């Protein structure tokens, strides 16, 4: 099928090597987005989106589908603001409202808002690995699951990291964030001699010499 492209999207397609690129051939001419702000073009293996203020960016098909689960540009992620680039054996792509990932296990998930901001801090990926799902809204705020732990957020507590393991399980036995401890107020932090510690709204849990210690 023959298609002739225009403006900054055609520009970006050319920059990627046109049909020789991973996108393959166009499967549409330039289309308007629902919200009357953007333009896009579909290709065999993904799409390019554009706004006057974000510029033209290709999104691979799997990450395009994942972006779709919160309704693409109409969702809080908004428009892509950069390319999908190699990231820890996967891809990371920045959006106005967060990030979309190809994971190293060839799955695709998004991160958004305050949880995105925490996940993007240096050292946090090393602690968590890839997302294993999208954000979940809960009573009091939100949380998200990653390979090696979770991030929890409430407006009062901010976004904080807790790892899988005995401290997480001890909090779980008391109903995690809905229970008497409430939300994590600190990131789980290593201490000397192998220990771990984290603060919650209404107490602290420590692991030292492989023993759990609790305060309320």
Swiss-Prot record:
Subcellular location(s) per record: Secreted
Top-rank taxon, per record: Bacteria
Its job: One of the two major secreted proteins.
Protein name: Protein PS1
Source organism of this protein record: Corynebacterium glutamicum (strain ATCC 13032 / DSM 20300 / JCM 1318 / BCRC 11384 / CCUG 27702 / LMG 3730 / NBRC 12168 / NCIMB 10025 / NRRL B-2784 / 534)
Lineage: Bacteria, Bacillati, Actinomycetota, Actinomycetes, Mycobacteriales
Name of encoding gene: csp1
Residues of the full protein shown: 442 to 657 of 657
